[PDB]
A paper describes a structure:
AZE synthases catalyse the intramolecular 4-exo-tet cyclisation of S-adenosylmethionine (SAM), yielding a highly strained heterocycle. More recently, AZE synthases have been discovered in bacteria, namely AzeJ and VioH, which are involved in the biosynthesis of azetidomonamides and vioprolides, respectively. Interestingly, they show sequence similarity to the class I methyltransferases (MT1). Each subunit adopts a classic Rossmann fold, consisting of a 7-stranded β-sheet (β3↑, β2↑, β1↑, β4↑, β5↑, β10↓, β9↑) surrounded by helices α4-6, α8-9 and α11, a topology that is typical for MT1 enzymes.
To gain a better understanding of the intramolecular cyclisation reaction of SAM to MTA and AZE, we determined the high-resolution structures of AzeJ and VioH. In contrast, we were able to obtain crystals in the presence of SAM or S-adenosyl-L-homocysteine (SAH), which diffracted up to 1.95 Å. Our analyses revealed that AzeJ forms a homodimer, whilst VioH is monomeric. Although the sequence identity between AzeJ and VioH is only 28%, their monomers share a remarkable structural similarity (backbone root mean square deviation (rmsd) = 1.8 Å, 72% Cα-atoms). Nevertheless, the catalysis in AzeJ and VioH would follow the same mechanistic principles, given their structural similarity. Indeed, a DFT cluster model of VioH, in which water molecules are bound near the sulfonium, reveals a high reaction barrier of ca. 23 kcal mol−1 in agreement with its low activity towards SAM. Intriguingly, co-expression of pxaA with azeJ led to the production of 3, which is in contrast to the experiment with pxaA and vioH and consistent with the in vitro observation that VioH alone had minimal catalytic activity.
Author numbering: 2 to 233
Write the structure that this text describes.
């Protein structure tokens, strides 16, 4: 999707809970169960596509270090206002205005202060599917060498119908679904462009960049692209 899409507020509709059908609520619950299931191996959660910080509350509750990464300034400002409000220290909870494309520049080893194995680059609610160039994101991920959890969707007709039911409740000028060699693409002329990549297309792309990924299916319509020792 476009930066303008989110900047101008159209993108806000995608985290309005009133717009979540049952299959997507189930998806978000399943997303959290996978995160919980490796929680004991996470000291630093890096939320990639964080918005205002959807999993900040998770990190606060579980006593984890937090970095929200999002290229939308108004979302970074919202997240930072939340940290100031509760008086949370910067050395534990931060926001970084940037793209997943430059993750390797945003997260140099020294800046972590946590072993690589206890870090998780968590891309929630199909943030990865809304990124301009997935090939750039995968290379950036490769160069960080950090464990990651890319939460996205399956490309079964049922998964596509779940996404259609979710996106259509945002009431954009029009909504197009297309299936091609890469995956299932939803577009709207507001600047919405959301992909779910076929398991058969993306797994080879992952391995090409040396990422030892497993596509873990969850909550009927989800697949979690999981790499790192906590997924042994
Ligand atoms: N290159 C990028 N790097 C990091 N975050 C990005 C990004 N491109 C978009 N995002 C952010 O990802 C967040 C969620 S987009 C997710 C859309 C929707 N939940 C879906 O199911 O497809 C937004 O805040 C957006 O600004």
């Amino acid at each position: 999707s476009t930066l303008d899409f989110y900047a101008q507020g159209q993108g806000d509709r995608l985290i309005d809970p009133a717009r979540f059908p049952a299959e997507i609520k189930a998806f978000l619950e399943g997303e959290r169960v996978l995160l919980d299931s490796v929680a004991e191996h996470v000291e630093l959660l890096v939320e990639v596509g964080s918005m205002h910080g959807q999993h900040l509350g998770w990190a606060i509750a579980r006593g984890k270090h937090y970095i929200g990464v999002d290229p939308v300034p108004r979302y970074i400002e919202q997240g930072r206002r939340t940290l100031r409000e509760q008086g949370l220290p910067a050395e534990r909870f931060r926001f970084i205005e940037g793209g997943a494309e430059e993750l390797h520049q945003l997260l140099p080893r020294h800046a972590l202060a946590v072993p690589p194995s206890r870090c998780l680059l968590f891309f929630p609610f199909n943030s990865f599917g809304n990124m301009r160039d997935p090939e750039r994101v995968l290379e950036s991920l490769s160069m960080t060498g950090l464990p990651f959890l890319i939460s996205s969707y399956a490309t079964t007709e049922r998964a596509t119908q779940a996404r259609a039911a979710y996106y259509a409740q945002c009431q954009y000028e029009w909504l197009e679904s297309a299936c091609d060699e890469r995956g299932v693409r939803f577009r709207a002329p507001e600047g919405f462009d959301a992909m779910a990549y076929h398991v058969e297309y993306l797994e080879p792309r992952m391995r090409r960049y040396g990422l030892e990924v497993r596509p873990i299916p969850f909550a009927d319509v989800g697949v979690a692209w999981c790499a790192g020792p906590m997924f042994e």
